[PDB]
């Protein structure tokens, strides 16, 4: 196996000069060997991606999936170690930077088909990974305006070179 996500919450950074930006806090948490499919954890983790911690906890509190309950427990644990061990001031000043799911170690079990046949079943296990970053949830990327589409077109009508000449 590989367990590198839990060693990330142990990087000590050099002390900061008094004229630099404050450097937001990063908190890495994860739960391993969850009796769930990674392909359903994906939808839960893509839903809570980029959200505030409180907004994420609301959506997970009212979602209907077993994975939503597990990810709520993991998010609450991560918030607790954020303001317990990584010196985050306000427990609401956090957002979900990264939220993904990985395959776990699974088990193979026979599934008796008819005739004399068999299928091999997978007892699926997954991982859930979360990085919390101190700060307000970052402003979403606004949609492209007609002015931005036109400026891109005219840049390209003006970037054209005479091809295959001197």
């Amino acid at each position: 196996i590989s367990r590198k996500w839990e060693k990330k919450n142990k990087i000590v950074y050099p002390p900061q000069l008094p004229g630099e930006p404050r450097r937001p806090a990063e908190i890495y948490h994860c739960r391993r060997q969850i009796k769930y499919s990674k392909d359903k954890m994906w939808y839960l983790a893509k839903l809570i991606r980029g959200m505030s911690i409180d907004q994420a906890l609301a959506q997970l509190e009212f979602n209907d999936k077993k994975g939503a309950k597990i990810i709520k427990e993991v998010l609450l644990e991560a918030q607790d170690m954020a303001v317990r061990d990584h010196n985050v001031e306000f427990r609401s000043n956090l957002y979900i930077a990264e939220s993904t799911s990985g395959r776990g170690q699974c088990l193979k079990r026979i599934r008796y088909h008819g005739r004399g046949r068999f299928g091999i079943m997978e007892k699926v296990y997954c991982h859930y990974f979360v990085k919390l970053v101190e700060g307000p949830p970052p402003p979403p990327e606004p949609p492209k305006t007609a002015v931005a589409h036109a400026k891109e077109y005219i840049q390209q009508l003006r970037s054209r070179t005479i091809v295959h000449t001197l």
Binding site: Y13, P15, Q16
Partner: protein
């Protein structure tokens, strides 16, 4: 029921604590106190006849300065040689993932050996001697975060300090040394410097059947 047992090189407590006197910092029975001391000092010199209690305080100051400087570079090997196993975890555990920047500016007044007590022989064949030393120095401190942000103290500013540091040497051991065991903080001590962040103390998380009774 093995014949091998753990060879402890320290104890877990303080032998007959020096209750710090009220007014020791505010102002800039004695025969029995200094009697228990002399009796014990002779016990230490029974175990090593080249000890001078007039020579200890400068050694204690050197051990203090060099131990706390190990906390700056994280030299845990030197720390295990200048501090006891009882003092190692409550000096390193809370700094493990933090940057500690400590300095020793000066000493306001010389250090005094203020209490010497010794344990009995029946501690597994080992006899320990514990000496209390008062210190009043001027130190700086700046504890940084995992991300390099300030949590505690100021970088350059020196602040006064009064500590009753208790050193211990295991006398029966052939290569024993005088190391820092604990330090007494008085019950009348001045309050410490405020931290640099706001803290929320949570109230009682109540089960639904429970009622908030103030």
């Amino acid at each position: 029921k093995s014949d091998r047992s753990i060879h402890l090189a320290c104890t877990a407590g303080i032998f007959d604590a020096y209750v710090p006197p009220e007014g020791d910092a505010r102002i800039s029975e004695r025969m029995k106190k200094t009697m228990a001391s002399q009796v014990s000092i002779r016990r230490i010199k029974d175990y090593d006849a080249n000890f001078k209690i007039k020579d200890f305080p400068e050694k204690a100051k050197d051990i203090f300065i060099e131990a706390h400087l190990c906390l700056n570079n994280s030299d845990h090997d030197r720390l295990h040689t200048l501090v006891t196993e009882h003092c190692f975890p409550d000096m390193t555990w809370d700094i493990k993932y933090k940057t500690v920047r400590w300095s020793f500016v000066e000493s306001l007044e010389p250090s005094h050996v203020v209490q010497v007590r010794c344990s009995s022989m029946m501690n597994q064949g080992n006899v320990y001697g514990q000496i209390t030393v008062r210190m009043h120095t001027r130190q700086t401190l700046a504890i940084y975060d995992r991300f390099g942000r300030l949590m505690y103290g100021q970088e350059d500013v020196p602040k006064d300090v009064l500590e009753y540091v208790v050193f211990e040497k295991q006398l029966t051991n052939p290569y024993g040394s005088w190391r820092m065991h604990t330090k007494i903080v008085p019950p009348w001590a001045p309050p410490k410097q405020p931290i640099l962040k706001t803290v929320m103390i949570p109230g009682p998380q109540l089960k639904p059947e429970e009622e908030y009774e103030e």
